[PDB]
Amino acid sequence: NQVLVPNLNPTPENLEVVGDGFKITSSINLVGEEEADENAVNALREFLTANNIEINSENDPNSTTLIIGEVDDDIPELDEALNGTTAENLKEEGYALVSNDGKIAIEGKDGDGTFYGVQTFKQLVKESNIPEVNITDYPTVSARGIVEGFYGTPWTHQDRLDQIKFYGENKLNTYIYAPKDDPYHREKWREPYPESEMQRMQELINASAENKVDFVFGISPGIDIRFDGDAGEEDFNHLITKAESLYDMGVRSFAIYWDNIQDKSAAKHAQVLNRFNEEFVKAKGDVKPLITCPTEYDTGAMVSNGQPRAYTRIFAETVDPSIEVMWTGPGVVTNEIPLSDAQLISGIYDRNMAVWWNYPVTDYFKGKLALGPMHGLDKGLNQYVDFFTVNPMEHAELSKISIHTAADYSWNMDNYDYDKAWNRAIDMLYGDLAEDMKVFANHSTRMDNKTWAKSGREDAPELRAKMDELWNKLSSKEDASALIEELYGEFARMEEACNNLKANLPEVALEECSRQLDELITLAQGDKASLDMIVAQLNEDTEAYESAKEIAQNKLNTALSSFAVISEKVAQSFIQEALSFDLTLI
Amino acid sequence: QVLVPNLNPTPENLEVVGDGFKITSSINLVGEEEADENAVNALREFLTANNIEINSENDPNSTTLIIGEVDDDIPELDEALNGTTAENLKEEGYALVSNDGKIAIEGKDGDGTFYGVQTFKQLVKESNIPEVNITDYPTVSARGIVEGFYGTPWTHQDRLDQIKFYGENKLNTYIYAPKDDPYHREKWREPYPESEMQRMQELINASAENKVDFVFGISPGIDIRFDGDAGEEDFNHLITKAESLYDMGVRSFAIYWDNIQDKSAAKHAQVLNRFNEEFVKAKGDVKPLITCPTEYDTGAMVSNGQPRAYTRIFAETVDPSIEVMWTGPGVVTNEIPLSDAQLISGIYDRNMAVWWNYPVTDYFKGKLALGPMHGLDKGLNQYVDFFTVNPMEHAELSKISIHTAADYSWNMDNYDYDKAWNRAIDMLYGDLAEDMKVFANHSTRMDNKTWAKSGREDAPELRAKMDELWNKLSSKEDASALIEELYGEFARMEEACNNLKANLPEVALEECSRQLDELITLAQGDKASLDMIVAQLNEDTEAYESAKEIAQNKLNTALSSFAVISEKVAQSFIQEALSFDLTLI
Ligand SMILES: CC(=O)Nc1ncc(CN2CC3(CCN(c4cc(C)nc5ncnn45)C3)C2)s1
Ligand SMILES: CC(=O)Nc1ncc(CN2CC3(CCN(c4cc(C)nc5ncnn45)C3)C2)s1
């Protein structure tokens, strides 16, 4: 009977169910349209239209009533429908939502809050039914988003527009434009963008404003920027001119990055930032705090023997307090940011830090897709961090899985459950293909280049535990029949799921993962043959063993030889384990 | 000035009370005719071997050595001890006092006096001895080896040498049970040939000489019959076989049920109980019967915290006096935590015996297990009164790990695996100790890639430095110093192994020469791996490709070979370096 609360992302801070729910009518009364946030109303109109829900011209008391507005708008209908629930005591971007007895109230703390209230409403409604809930909600972290800051083919204009919509839908409010292989960002940073590219930029800025996203325009001048004399003045004016060109199209957030460069002129880097902050940021008056990243940006690079290194010390002492400083954690690509690391670096800089999290980015190990949740990031990090971003894959569509979880982590940090969030991300993104995509993506969460880059949740941990249990059972001389049968089913399911994804995934997703799907099919076949080897030894069948051995070997060799990389420590490793296995040594 | 040298086992109580003194060219020996005969023989052997003559008449300028047991009333010994006593110590305990040209050795019993001599032997280095007060005794009552592996059994000469070695390190148990001796297992009814019976007599005599209990094992489980006239015949074959060894002096026996098809729990225990009644109790001077059930690891014995059917029936049936062996959580496993000992001890309602499967390598013969006792809980003596190790078929190189087992079993509470390991190589390899440490450090971790995993990780300090190299490179720090340090490390691996090839005695070298070559090959690959990194840092394509080919070839040779060493350190580093691309930083 009772209408259940569907999947929500981010998880709202406070949600109480206070009723059995109700069906929203074929047409609705909309109150507060003209006074409420324009972008919130546009998003609401889009949703209603897309779900065949008409807006009434005149009030119909038989129709459902939706009341929308901000706390500073005088809407008595909103106050009545809210019934004591308030948004005024909530932080910026916060909102209140109350659905009760054919009335939905949405009250933002501000215009951004009202917009995010609409996003929750959009997720609450399934087949015109809505639960009866009392919500007050607001972000843990002030700035939440993406930094397109990877090497490789930059995202297409269409990728970016789609990403911006997606960020709005999941309450992510920051998009930093800084692709390493854009010549006009970095290599040829002084040169103005072509008109065609400037028109694309304008479209991105408009889409960002439409979805409450701060478009942050990045510039990376550190390769060859000159600091002193007339050359210094010429180059600084190039930064201003470039920034001005994007300011004039609507950009109100800026980043100047010093990462991955030869030059470590600490004072000079900070002085360029301070001058830009004085002469541009403070000058314009409506520009958000300047963002940067120093040349030392991971703790290994920044700290030695618990003390800052020379560059970091000078940069920290020189750089203006208002400037947002990014760092990546203990390493460039690392397992965790524990609370002690954030404490250390925040202490050195004497400010709340910004995070450039290098997951799900795969530019260092392009064969594998990073399809796992936010993992290893301390749930108290908000104590020392006010700005959280992820560096995504060049593969924009499949980056959404990990980004979806980052929205949950950054908005509701204290209740973040990586496993539940990961499942929720695939459920909400893939729909009817969600269960099959889970089977595939479960094998492609761990990033490990075998040396310096290690991050993410382990691949297929439940399957790996069962594989370990097989070897233990065999050594203990127990009957492994039931476990072997279970594993045959697991490996069959991997093949079945991937074949269904090849047949039915939309091309936008399939074009990014087709080789990885084939890779996991090949490994699954090798895994099946690996079980055949074990069963053959148990039955003392040499012919059957040698036949299963050559298949297992061929499948492993193909997997190892191919560009695609997946399930290294689970599906791939199991074949190697099974090839080594000699039952006569038990 | 004179420091306390390496001791094994670590004595329970040791106090330094002086600057030490030089032992003279000749010595006065008091208590010869009253003291333990085996202790005196061991002492004479040591003195003779170190060119120390025994005075006929007392010389006051010569060092004096006074030896005896506590139950003897010997004033010369009491005076030199100066209040230190062995009377309140347990069995095998002793007191030793070195002070102002006098060394006093007092055993609680004959075994203690013997062990006192062993500590004395270790205390002396280049005729100098520290001035110390020692009281000392074992944690665990029965401490030793079970020759219970598959593969070529130890030679008669290997066994005689091992028995001496056990005496020297206060190990008191040697269980004869080699799987591939036909007369032990396959043809267990059949009598040993006279030539082999003479060799057994020699092992028994040597065991007595070194205070070792020779445990004669029989493994009848493959085809023993239990019921009717066939059951009587086969039981009498066990008695007959046991009797043959009893008549040469064997007073400890084992009947093992491991690694057999038959799981007739009640019948296994009934054979043991009948042997216990009709033989052990009958003879009256036979130590408790030792066994091992067919379910002997916790994975095989226990399901959902409760004993499995065989184990339940075996435990309820088997006589309380019988020592039951188990191997820990698995056959070859990382640890025996205290909870596992608790569980299994509780099931059997008795203190357990341990059959520890390290350093045995019969499941993965390519690698030598040269590491210390590792993962065994230091509280295990609560539930365990009998500790043994299954060694490698390689008897000489098994000494390294066995050395540490002597420390662990004698002084459990102060057991430090790292210190014990270093001490084992120092004490065994002498002038080659430093080089042998370099080699053996890479050959401690046993891992067959599936079910058998045990031992300390290989070369952990080097592995940490390799990790630090990758981190430094990613953090864009100057790695010059660390690269140079690693070049030194890899060069040292090659230098140490070549020296060991040239100078190790044949007895050791014949067991490890392939593994020495393996580590040399890996070290050469590791050097070439650094050359690859340096070539990328200098943007030298010619130098990179040259180093790459060498690294590739050395890796392949290492992988293809029978010999296995340093899989996660020296081997893995080459694979890591081949994967490394500096342009992706
Ligand atoms: C009670 C107990 O712990 N008893 C043991 N006894 C020998 C042990 C050390 N090895 C572990 C394995 C398991 C079996 N194995 C081999 C190797 C070869 C070369 N041939 C073999 N034939 C039949 N088994 N087996 C390797 C035995 S532990
Ligand atoms: C402050 C910060 O975190 N800034 C970053 N920016 C990009 C990031 C994610 N990737 C890790 C790597 C390390 C460098 N890298 C590549 C790849 C390729 C294909 N070409 C490259 N050329 C020079 N580097 N580099 C891989 C960058 S993290």
Ligand SMILES: [Ca+2]
């Ligand atoms: Ca308004």
Ligand SMILES: [Cl-]
């Ligand atoms: Cl007991």
Ligand SMILES: [Cl-]
């Ligand atoms: Cl020799």
